[PDB]
């Protein structure tokens, strides 16, 4: 997981959109596969085909979110000429949230997902700019 | 006078789970003395 995140953060914002969209789509796909694996192990599918359908459903749903976020956030930075801006990630985060509403066919989930995922992406950008640590190395 | 829980209110906390779903509709509260 550290190799993809290294590739994504190496590219400058607002440039090389296709490369950016690939890193986030692959990241989204991985999360989808992880969710599918636990889902299939802890909630046995009725048949082999039902298990494959569920895995594809979750995995595509997660890659769809990862693709839209990467693409939308990279275009926003390009169009606005604002690379180091959290607002681009907020736009990209909300777009991914709407997809979840569509894939889950709902309006409340889409609205809730847009706000929560939109804020989360913006916070991620701020932490990158300001060097916020999630898993901080012990220092004292 | 001050309201206190009635049988309707108390039965909310007497089920196998707090939030019934389709998955847990068949669950039943375990025996009172743990012996099956």
């Amino acid at each position: 997981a550290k190799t993809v995140l290294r590739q994504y953060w190496d590219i400058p914002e607002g440039t090389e959109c296709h490369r950016k969209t690939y890193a986030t789509t692959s990241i989204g796909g991985a999360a989808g596969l992880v969710v599918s694996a636990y889902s299939v192990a802890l909630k046995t599918p009725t048949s082999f085909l039902e298990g494959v359908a569920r895995t594809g459903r979750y995995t595509f749903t997660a890659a769809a979110i990862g693709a839209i976020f990467g693409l939308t956030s990279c275009i926003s930075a390009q169009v606005r000429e604002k690379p180091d801006d959290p607002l681009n990630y907020l736009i990209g985060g909300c777009a991914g949230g709407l997809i979840l509403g569509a894939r889950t066919r709902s309006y409340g989930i889409g609205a809730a997902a847009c706000a929560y995922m939109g804020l989360t992406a913006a916070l991620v950008k701020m932490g990158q700019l300001e060097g916020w640590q999630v898993f901080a190395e012990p220092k004292v | 006078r001050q309201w206190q829980p009635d049988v309707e209110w108390a039965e909310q906390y007497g089920g196998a789970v707090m939030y019934p779903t389709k998955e847990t509709a068949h669950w039943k509260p375990p025996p009172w003395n743990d012996v099956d």
């Binding site: 991985a30 694996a37 192990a41 | 939030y19």
Partner: protein, 55 residues
């Protein structure tokens, strides 16, 4: 419109739903030894291949 609906909706009402849904995901388990140890295998594999916790 505002004080009995939307200011309720955007926070306390929606937050409670998410936790209730999340709780039903965590606790709706079948109590099967086979399924739990299967998840242990997925966890150990993911820990290495995805996160390299063995490094």
């Amino acid at each position: 419109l505002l004080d009995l609906i939307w200011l309720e909706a955007i926070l306390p009402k929606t937050i409670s739903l998410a936790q209730m849904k999340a709780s039903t995901l965590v606790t709706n388990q079948k109590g099967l030894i086979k399924l739990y140890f299967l998840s242990f295998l997925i966890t150990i594999l993911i820990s290495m291949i995805l996160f390299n916790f063995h490094e």
